[PDB]
Structure 1
Amino acid sequence: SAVQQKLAALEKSSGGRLGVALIDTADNTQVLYRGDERFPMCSTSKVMAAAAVLKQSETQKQLLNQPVEIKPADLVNYNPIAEKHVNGTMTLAELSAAALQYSDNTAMNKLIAQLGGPGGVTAFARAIGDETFRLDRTEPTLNTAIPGDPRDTTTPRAMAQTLRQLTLGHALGETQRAQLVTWLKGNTTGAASIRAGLPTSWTVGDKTGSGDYGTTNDIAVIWPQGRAPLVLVTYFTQPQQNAESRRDVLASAARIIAEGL
């Protein structure tokens, strides 16, 4: 299609490797570009950890209010919110919000611990039918994004389907789904990524990710005004370990997708 030719040209112009998956929930049509290739998830994996904790809270009704101590040893490389609460506590809700809306890496590690390790996050993915997602490491090493390394990867197709199920479907309870949507809509790190390629009037909930090899990711649910929602995953990675982030590529891919719907 026109769109796949334009995405291929965008990729060629960028020097990297681009993966895109769009689900249009109006007709369940899909647009895929490198849809079944593995990409490093980096912080887009935080959505799965938060959602796994939300799933636990369906049975442990008070779980999100459970206080979790933030100790100096817990801090890793990027902890904008957890830093504000060292030697204090944050609830699991606050940690989930921090991981999602500020990409706090300490918060992610606390969520992973709550789930019993990376295997607990992966198990949740399997439980909702995602056989592709794998979380292998904690923060910050899950962001190494080494070419060919299957650790901490998923595919665009898989992540789009899973994000649809978590936000628009019923993989979570009604209260939990609404909470996840609210958290995603309140993301603070996405202004230059998918959002920047879309009409300003559309409502977006997203989670960015970034890592080594100039890995620049964003996964989003999109609510156009007067139109069924869309799920859009954009993953991008580059051949040089020290490459700079390219959020503009994600914006451009979103713009290309938005042309045509």
Structure 2
Amino acid sequence: TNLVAEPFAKLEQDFGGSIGVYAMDTGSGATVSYRAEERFPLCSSFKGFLAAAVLARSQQQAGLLDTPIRYGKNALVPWSPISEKYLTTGMTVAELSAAAVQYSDNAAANLLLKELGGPAGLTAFMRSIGDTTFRLDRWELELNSAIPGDARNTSSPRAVTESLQKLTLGSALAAPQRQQFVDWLKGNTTGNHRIRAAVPADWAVGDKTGTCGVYGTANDYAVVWPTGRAPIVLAVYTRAPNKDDKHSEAVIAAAARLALEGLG
């Protein structure tokens, strides 16, 4: 039996569902993998990749990130705490991106999707960096049904981690864009009980969360800079078979701890 995997299996069994984990130590190449290639709903975790795709576009569209977007109430949707405040002043593309990443702002995410040509445009960006797994085909708040066996609006922990590495540490973005993406992730406000809860306080973390809620479905992915080490990239996703099964932040943190423990 896979002895590395046993504690993850116990964790998911106690949770009442399935947990998917992939973690990469970018310094040694070591990995920890559990259900790493299975699909899980993205939920709001797509918004990190959204911001990266906008940054990529901004490399060749001069002043895109600086452009004020003047939107009206028709653009607002539930859980848009940043964009509700700028109906008469607008937000720049950079500000919308920070709101989508750091507050999971739904209206901001939809405005940014428009800049890419919709969910298909984000999916095409992901294909362009070599991610064949990511799929997104709805706008907020229509991508979160998380129905078991529906591959729409899903990715895998492994593909999420691989793409996150390319974008935050590798060469998929030009350096000033890579750096902005990292700084947005580091300022996330919604992840304090997930991967951030699994690391020492002195280790820097950038992350993006998602919580479909139904079907026990929630997630987090992160880049972690342990003191004195190369960074770790990891993703933790959950789901469960019944619509009213509850997600758990504690399970996500616990899986992240096991991942860090299993790395060399």
TM score, norm. by length of structure 2? 0.96
Which residue type is aligned with residue 230 of structure 1?
Answer: I
Alignment of 1:64-143 (within 5 A): 64-143=65-144
Answer whether contact 2:222 2:233 (CA < 8 A) is retained: yes
1:238 aligns with 2:251: no
User: Can you give the 5+ residue segments of structure 2 that lack an aligned partner in the other structure?
Assistant: none
Q: Which amino acid aligns with 1:19?
A: G
CA contact (8 A) 1:206 1:221 kept: yes
Mapped contact 1:193–1:218 kept (Cα < 8 A): yes
Q: 1:186 corresponds to which residue?
A: 187
**TM-score, length-normalised on structure 1?**
0.97
1:148 is aligned to 149
Q: Distance in 1 between matches of 2:150 and 2:262?
A: 35
1:172 aligns to 2:173 (yes or no): yes
- Give the letter for the 1:163 counterpart: L
Aligned to 1:250, the other structure's residue is in SS state: helix
Q: Which moved more, 1:228-237 or 1:2-11?
A: 2-11
Answer with 154-163 or 240-249: which moved more: 240-249
Taking the aligned partners of 1:125 and 1:29, their CA distance within structure 2 comes to 24
1:160 alignment partner in structure 2: 161
Shift of 1:2: 4.1
CA shift for structure 1 position 71:
1.2
Change (3 A) 1:242 1:77: farther
The residue type equivalent to 2:220 in the other structure is D
Greater alpha carbon shift after TM alignment, 236-245 vs 3-12: 236-245
1:199 equivalent in alignment to 2:221: no
Query: How many Å separate the matches in 2 of 1:107 and 1:205?
Result: 20
Aligned twin of 2:14: 13
| Distance apart, 1:214 and its partner CA | 2.6
SS in 2 for 1:125: helix
Question: Matches of 1:121 and 1:130 in 2, distance apart?
Answer: 11
Q: Does 1:55 align with 2:56?
A: yes
Hey, what's the Cα distance between the residues in 2 that align with 1:108 and 1:131? Answer: 22
Q: Percent identity?
A: 53
Q: 1:259 aligns with which of 258, 261, 264?
A: 261
Distance (whole Å) between structure 2 residues aligned to residue 140 and residue 242 of structure 1: 19
Amino acid of the residue matched to residue 148 of structure 1? G
C-alpha contact (below 8 Å) 1:70/1:82 kept by paired residues: no
Whole-Å Cα distance in 1 between the matches of residues 223 and 75 of structure 2? Answer: 31
Gaps of 5+ in 1: none
- Distance in 2 (CA, whole Å) between partners of 1:171 and 1:95 is 21
Please report how far the alpha carbon of residue 240 of structure 1 lies from its aligned counterpart in structure 2 after TM superposition. 2.2
Equivalent in 216, 220, 229 of residue 214 of structure 1: 216
**Comparing 78-87 with 125-134, which one deviates more in the overlay?**
78-87
The separation in 1 between residues aligned to 2:73 and 2:3, in whole angstroms, is 52
Q: Matched residues in 2 for 1:91 and 1:8: separation? A: 45
* Structure 1 residue runs of 4 or more that deviate by more than 4 Å after TM superposition: none
1:243 deviation in Å?
2.9
**Alignment deviations for residues 161-198 of structure 1 (CA, whole Å, 9 cap, x no partner):** 00000001010000000000000000000000111111
User: How many residue pairs end up in the alignment?
Assistant: 261
Cα distance in 2 for residues equivalent to 1:231 and 1:3: 18
Contact 2:41-2:146 within 8 A present in 1 as well: yes
Amino acid at match of 2:195: I
Instruction: Measure, in 2, the Cα distance between the counterparts of 1:219 and 1:198.
Output: 13
